Amino acid sequence: MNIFEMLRIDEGLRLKIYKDTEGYYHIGIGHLLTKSPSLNAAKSELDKAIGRNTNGVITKDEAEKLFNQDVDAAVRGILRNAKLKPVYDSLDAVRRAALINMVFQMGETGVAGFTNSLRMLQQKRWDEAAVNLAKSRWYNQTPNRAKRVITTFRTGTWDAYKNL
């Protein structure tokens, strides 16, 4: 199992513009188009990202292309982040995958704000962090996903994703 498979599970794959749980427009494999109300705005951003006139629809290859660029940017974001870097460098390979997942979903900025949970992960206090992490809007809005990542940090294995 790896980060691409993991996120492919959590995000799904939609070939047409769609709204995610917070009503924002996306496409592909959890690719944020725009934060605004305009489908037009969204269609606009989509064409600029793809480089062609899409008319709100893209191919699988196109989606995978944005996906690879997005995974790439999440990792780089973590590495350039003063609050995130040390945490990530202190973790094992599986746990690193869980942090990249969070970053991909809510942004560096949103993750760097889980201050207390970050300290706990850094100290290898697995069960304590998992409870802290669950005290969040993030867990209350998308509990099944949040749970999967959380057990992941807890246990350091892919158990939560096997059978998916």
Rounded distance, CA 114 to CA 122, Å? 12
Q: Which two tokens stand for residue 17?
A: 């513009």
Angle at which helices 115-122 and 93-112 pack, to 10 degrees?
Answer: 160
Q: Which two tokens stand for residue 123?
A: 């100290």
> What is the phi-psi region of residue 31: left when phi exceeds 0, alpha when psi lies from -120 to 50, beta otherwise?
beta
Which residues are known binding-site members for substrate? Answer: 32, 104, 117, 132
Residues marked active site are found at: 11, 20
∠104-8-105 over CA atoms, to 5°? 20
CATH number for the domain that contains residue 111: 1.10.530.40
Q: Measuring CA to CA, how many Å separate 45 from each of 48, 56, 60, 89?
A: 5, 10, 18, 34
Domain that includes residue 43, residue range: 1-164
Rounded distance, CA 23 to CA 10, Å? 17
* Exposure b/e, 97-119, CB count within 10 A at least 16 = b: bbbbbbbbbeebeebbebeebbe
Cβ atoms 33, 45 nearer than 8 A? yes
Rounded distance, CA 161 to CA 125, Å? 22
Domain count of the fold of the chain: 1
> What is the phi-psi region of residue 156: left when phi exceeds 0, alpha when psi lies from -120 to 50, beta otherwise?
left
